[PDB]
Design a protein around this ligand. Structure first.
Ligand SMILES: Nc1nc2[nH]cnc2c(=O)[nH]1
Ligand SMILES: [Mg+2]
Ligand SMILES: [Mg+2]
Ligand SMILES: [Mg+2]
Ligand SMILES: [Mg+2]
Ligand SMILES: [Mg+2]
Ligand SMILES: [Mg+2]
Ligand SMILES: [Mg+2]
Ligand SMILES: [Mg+2]
Ligand SMILES: [Mg+2]
Ligand SMILES: [Mg+2]
Ligand SMILES: [Mg+2]
Ligand SMILES: [Mg+2]
Ligand SMILES: [Mg+2]
Ligand SMILES: [Mg+2]
Ligand SMILES: [Mg+2]
Ligand SMILES: [Mg+2]
Ligand SMILES: [Mg+2]
Ligand SMILES: [Mg+2]
Ligand SMILES: [Mg+2]
Ligand SMILES: [Mg+2]
Ligand SMILES: [Mg+2]
Ligand SMILES: [Mg+2]
Ligand SMILES: [Mg+2]
Ligand SMILES: [Mg+2]
Ligand SMILES: [Mg+2]
Ligand SMILES: [Mg+2]
Ligand SMILES: [Mg+2]
Ligand SMILES: [Mg+2]
Ligand SMILES: [Mg+2]
Ligand SMILES: [Mg+2]
Ligand SMILES: [Mg+2]
Ligand SMILES: [Mg+2]
Ligand SMILES: [Mg+2]
Ligand SMILES: [Mg+2]
Ligand SMILES: [Mg+2]
Ligand SMILES: [Mg+2]
Ligand SMILES: [Mg+2]
Ligand SMILES: [Mg+2]
Ligand SMILES: [Mg+2]
Ligand SMILES: [Mg+2]
Ligand SMILES: [Mg+2]
Ligand SMILES: [Mg+2]
Ligand SMILES: [Mg+2]
Ligand SMILES: [Mg+2]
Ligand SMILES: [Mg+2]
Ligand SMILES: [Mg+2]
Ligand SMILES: [Mg+2]
Ligand SMILES: [Mg+2]
Lengths: 123, 209, 56, 125, 114
RNA sequence: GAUGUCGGCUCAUCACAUCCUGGGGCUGAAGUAGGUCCCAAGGGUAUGGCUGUUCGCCAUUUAAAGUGGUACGCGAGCUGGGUUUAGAACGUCGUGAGACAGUUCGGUCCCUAUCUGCCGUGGGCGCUGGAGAACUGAGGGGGGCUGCUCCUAGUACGAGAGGACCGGAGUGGACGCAUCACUGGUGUUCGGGUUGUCAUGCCAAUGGCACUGCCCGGUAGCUAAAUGCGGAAGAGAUAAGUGCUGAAAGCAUCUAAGCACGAAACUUGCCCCGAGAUGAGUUCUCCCUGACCCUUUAAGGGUCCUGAAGGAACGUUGAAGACGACGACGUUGAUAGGCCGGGUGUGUAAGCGCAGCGAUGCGUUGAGCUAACCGGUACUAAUGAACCGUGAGGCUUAACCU
RNA sequence: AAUUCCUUGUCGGGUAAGUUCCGACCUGCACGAAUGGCGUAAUGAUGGCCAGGCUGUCUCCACCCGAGACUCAGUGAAAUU
RNA sequence: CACAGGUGGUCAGGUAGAGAAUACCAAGGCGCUUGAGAGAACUCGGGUGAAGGAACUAGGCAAAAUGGUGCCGUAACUUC
RNA sequence: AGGACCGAACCGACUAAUGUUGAAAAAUUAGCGGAUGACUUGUGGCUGGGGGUGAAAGGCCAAUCAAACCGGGAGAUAGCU
């Protein structure tokens, strides 16, 4: 449950450390982005020699949230923080080559197959 | 197709073999007894009037009692009508069970919604509250403007204002029929239906796809 | 906010058309003491449904 | 809304209500009959009747629990020594409300609330 | 309520082992891993238990790649294949929410040896 | 002898010169995507950075971010940042008091709603004897949005790049209603921990006060962030438009006669109200079967006797409620409280015993306590009774029957 | 610029985006030396701007506790007309 | 006005505390001269709040937050 | 030592909400500044209306001060309503 101004951690090796949600994509007046949703982000903090820089405006897929995901039996999987994976603005494909921390099977799509394969754990 | 009268028992869930939890409303559908058959010749329209449940003899008035006596049925908690289709035919004193819904895929469920009493514009009409701070004076959940000026010089009919919320006839459409069991007097529908536990429900096959 | 026009004695009476009191119609007599009383209430001498329930 | 809720607020806060019913439960145990408003007599049953139920089993723990709810050892002594045995075989309903007048000063509906098998000797002394 | 109770107990698991808050539990869950259907283990501390007949649940907390993961299991769900206590934990509270503010050495729970 | 100014907030309502979605003609329209005009007002129609701003520029969205009217809509609805008071300063002008339609810092926003209007909710009487229900449906209101992916099909089209119509499937955004089973929030009425202090004689155990003293949890209910469902399809008549047959006018011509199509607008279809629909409708059932007197003699007035069905009253009350209303129950009784058993929540009470110098630990013990919950149970309270409402129901004509 | 009309001047910085802010330029409509000029540590319920923490300020409002509002009894106003 | 306003001096118990702050009490004085119910909107005054965390607004207005003692340690600049 | 620091009494009055036919003709509540000094306060005294007093706001001079209040000239005058 991510909105504009939300700060997220980064679940990849793009070089980004802290990103802010500047837009929840996918609809007019669309309020929140959850696990699996694409967001528009600004880089607030980045490592000295990464794939991205502080101030860069791009996209990201949300992979972990404090609100978590519901499963068809009524179950919930929640995370201690909100994390995202940086995506190229046009291709909407990952910038990084490695994924950190667990991800959920909700990413099982043709476009986020790379994220589930790279992830250490899939819940 | 005709519908039946029931009672909202409450909600539970049905767990499936593929790990799905279906939220269900338990509806008690006891036999519905035909108290009157309305035809074109006598009434100008075709329908069945039904009763269900039981009523204390000391609460059944003489006018009520005579109407049940004519049908040859015991007194029920009330009377409800269902319009007949062409080809649909019933008889006075006939019993209709929940099995009517056996091969009915979706139903429309009517109930009297829970009463919220006198409700403000925020609860009743989802009006947005004004500032909690920033100098607001006595005007947080208050409705704001209710009109324009000298043109039109009046508030319009239908203006969203505070008033009685709930405790009214509400129909929830196209609910999936999960289970029918005449032996247990049961109908399980997927999702929530209007009303409180113990209140009467009208169940009819879905009017839409 | 205040009236622009003085309301009438007619109007006053119309407003008051629901103000009349209702006389109690629910008085019973105790079978033992013979005292009048409000239904479901004890009598002045402390009788209720023919029995002396309060010694006052 | 107030849907399925129990307990009268009585234009008081929580700690005042509790203090008052602790006093009023003591008054009824002591005198065996009291005159109060109809809503207060109705609320009182919910405080005094579980006290008599507790007094049906004499133990140090039950006496201490009754003391925590009454803070009067004369009241806990009468509960366990007199009322507990007197009501031993009665399954609830140890009290009775008898509706009476209207209070002169404010037109409040009054009621008498008494212990079902009243001792006129204990009431006088 | 009697009708609901009857509909509920016929769906209730009979073999639920006894576990309590602070215990380390391993839940074996049915998952669809692409085109495959296998059992997946989720081991961690029971931080909450909701005892509610058919609506019973339990919250299991684990540390994955330095960050906390909480899973709320619906006890009577066919998705939950088995539950086994791996370690008995000694705690005073029903709800171990204070463990969310604890990391590594501070989040350790003593073993219940009785 | 006062009609409060800009902008914002809240709440809107109309127009159409239409922003999107829908239909269509022309295109310098291959496709995709556009341009322009016609038809169309059903719904839908961003959040931010800067500034008092409206606007505007900029960032990032969106199917789209419409243009206008409504006292440049809306202060007896809110704000008070801009802007006309009094303080003060700078630049400029003036000898000066002062001045600026220059800038700058600071700077009191009242009104308990009588009438109209509107949102809710009652009381009265009427509908022609009275009464209890179930309805018919005139009329009124609500709703009406849309993305993306997939299949058709890498097809038609195209040198390629790219890439459809028609039709079908799925899944979302926003909006709306309902519900509390799940996930949670709350839960000063449940359980526990703890600080300071005062009391219950003291120990131990408890209680008061300090924001519920401060906290950790949490039942029922309420509830959204939770999870169900909805917008439709279809039908009728159309708009712009496309046509068939066809004269006037030997031909031609969608039109004059005749005929076929055609849109999110319109009428239906869906949801809610609804016979005060005084044009007061229909159906089923229930109840009432005594005399007398008087006058201006008539649909007249009154008296005695009668008092039904039903309604109400009183009481116990409700997931019903401001009050009223509405629903359940009243001993031939589960309506409320209590009581019993369970569940739930808290998390192993007290007392005693053991271990330790002690704090404290261990055992008895998942203990004790447990609201609004579930299943039961007449222990308490729901009294035999009373009040309102009557006593066979107008005239005319017709049709049956006497 | 508490001074600059044109003006949101231009350039740089900060922000995803900055009519304000900070640094710089000089084209000072209309700075300038006790009408004091330019600085200046400390001080300030002083004006402008940025950040961390924090949060119902807001997305967007939910539940709860109290005092009114509502009902009964007693007393009993007002402006206006 | 039996009015939440104003009015100079003196006295200074216990526990905790730096204290005449503050909390609980003693002596002593009081419950404030309409009450009874109910538990709607809305207003006032409070408590708790998922995910987010200034996106609010003219402006963080209001809230929330910080808060004690000891020791360690502490930058530019400075009139030292 | 200090118009030193933090902070009650005491003196003041920066912000907000409430109240605005008020509990109050300027307050209440939560916060705020000074708190050994150009401090604060009691009792009594002196200055008087074109006059006083003023760390200066045209502030204050007995609840409206760019000329107090009361009585008088007085029935000022009013080409105005
Ligand atoms: N006591 C009593 N019981 C009833 N049951 C049905 N009506 C009544 C009534 O009026 N009184
Ligand atoms: Mg009915
Ligand atoms: Mg209700
Ligand atoms: Mg808002
Ligand atoms: Mg005000
Ligand atoms: Mg307010
Ligand atoms: Mg107005
Ligand atoms: Mg008009
Ligand atoms: Mg009161
Ligand atoms: Mg207290
Ligand atoms: Mg208690
Ligand atoms: Mg006038
Ligand atoms: Mg047009
Ligand atoms: Mg043109
Ligand atoms: Mg429109
Ligand atoms: Mg566009
Ligand atoms: Mg205007
Ligand atoms: Mg106002
Ligand atoms: Mg100006
Ligand atoms: Mg000035
Ligand atoms: Mg009709
Ligand atoms: Mg002790
Ligand atoms: Mg109707
Ligand atoms: Mg022990
Ligand atoms: Mg029990
Ligand atoms: Mg007669
Ligand atoms: Mg900013
Ligand atoms: Mg500068
Ligand atoms: Mg009164
Ligand atoms: Mg007084
Ligand atoms: Mg006083
Ligand atoms: Mg003083
Ligand atoms: Mg003090
Ligand atoms: Mg008083
Ligand atoms: Mg209230
Ligand atoms: Mg929060
Ligand atoms: Mg939180
Ligand atoms: Mg933060
Ligand atoms: Mg902003
Ligand atoms: Mg804004
Ligand atoms: Mg502040
Ligand atoms: Mg605070
Ligand atoms: Mg000093
Ligand atoms: Mg103060
Ligand atoms: Mg200070
Ligand atoms: Mg100080
Ligand atoms: Mg003096
Ligand atoms: Mg003269
Ligand atoms: Mg004169």
């Amino acid at each position: 449950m991510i909105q504009e101004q939300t700060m997220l951690n980064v679940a990849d090796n793009s070089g980004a450390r802290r990103v802010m949600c500047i837009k929840v994509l996918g609809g007019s007046h669309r309020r929140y982005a959850g696990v699996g949703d694409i967001i528009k982000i600004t880089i607030k903090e980045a490592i000295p020699r990464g794939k991205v820089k502080k101030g860069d405006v791009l996209k990201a897929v949300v992979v972990r949230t404090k609100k978590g995901v519901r499963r068809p039996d009524g179950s919930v999987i929640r995370f201690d923080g909100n994390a995202c994976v940086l995506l190229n603005n046009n291709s909407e494909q990952p910038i990084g080559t490695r994924i950190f921390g667990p991800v959920t099977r909700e990413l099982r799509s043709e476009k986020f197959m790379k994220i589930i394969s790279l992830a250490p754990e899939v819940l | 197709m005709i519908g039946l009268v029931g009672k909202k028992v409450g909600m539970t869930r049905i767990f499936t073999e593929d790990g799905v939890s279906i939220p269900v409303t338990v509806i008690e559908v006891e036999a519905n007894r035909v108290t009157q058959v309305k035809d074109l010749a006598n009434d100008g329209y075709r329908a069945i009037q039904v009763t269900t449940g039981a009523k204390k003899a000391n609460r059944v008035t003489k006018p009520e009692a005579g109407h049940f006596a004519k049908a040859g049925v015991e007194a029920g908690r009330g009377l409800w009508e269902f319009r007949l289709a062409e080809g649909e035919e019933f008889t006075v004193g006939q019993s209709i069970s929940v099995e009517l819904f056996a091969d009915v895929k979706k139903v429309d469920v009517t109930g009297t919604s829970k009463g919220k009493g006198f409700a403000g514009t925020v609860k009743r009409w989802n009006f947005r509250t004004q500032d909690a701070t920033h100098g607001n004076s006595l005007s947080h959940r208050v409705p704001g403007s209710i009109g324009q000026n000298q043109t039109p010089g009046k508030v319009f009919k239908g203006k969203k204002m505070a008033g009685q919320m709930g405790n009214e006839r509400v129909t929830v459409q196209s609910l999936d029929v999960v289970r029918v069991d005449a032996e247990r007097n049961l109908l399980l529908v997927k999702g929530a239906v209007p009303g409180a536990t113990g209140s009467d429900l009208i169940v009819k096959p879905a009017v839409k796809a | 906010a205040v009236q622009q026009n003085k309301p009438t004695r007619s109007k006053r009476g119309m407003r008051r058309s629901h103000d009349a009191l209702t006389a109690v119609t629910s008085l019973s007599v105790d079978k033992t003491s013979g005292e009048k009383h409000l239904r479901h209430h004890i009598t002045a001498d402390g009788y209720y449904r023919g029995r002396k329930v309060i010694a006052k | 809304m107030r849907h399925r809720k129990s307990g009268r607020q009585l234009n008081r806060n929580s700690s005042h209500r509790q203090a008052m019913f602790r006093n009023m439960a003591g008054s009824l145990v002591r005198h065996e009959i009291i005159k109060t408003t109809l809503p207060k007599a109705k609320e009182l049953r919910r405080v005094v009747e579980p006290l008599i139920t507790l007094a049906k089993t004499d133990s140090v723990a039950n006496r201490r629990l009754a003391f925590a709810r009454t803070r009067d050892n004369e009241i806990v002594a009468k509960l366990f020594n007199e009322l507990g045995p007197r009501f031993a075989s009665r399954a609830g309903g140890y009290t009775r409300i008898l509706k009476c007048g209207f209070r002169a000063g404010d037109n409040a509906p009054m009621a008498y609330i008494e212990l079902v098998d009243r001792s006129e000797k204990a009431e006088a002394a | 309520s009697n009708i609901i109770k009857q509909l509920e107990q016929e769906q209730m698991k009979q073999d639920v082992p006894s576990f309590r808050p602070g215990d380390t539990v391993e839940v074996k869950v049915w998952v669809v891993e692409g085109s495959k259907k296998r059992l997946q283990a989720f081991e961690g501390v029971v931080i909450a238990i909701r005892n509610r007949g058919l609506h019973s649940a339990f919250t299991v907390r684990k540390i994955s790649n330095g960050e906390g993961v909480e899973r709320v299991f619906q006890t009577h769900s066919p998705v939950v294949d088995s539950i086994s206590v791996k370690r008995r934990g000694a705690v005073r509270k029903a709800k171990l929410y204070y463990l969310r503010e604890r990391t590594g050495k501070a989040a350790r729970i003593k073993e219940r040896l009785n």
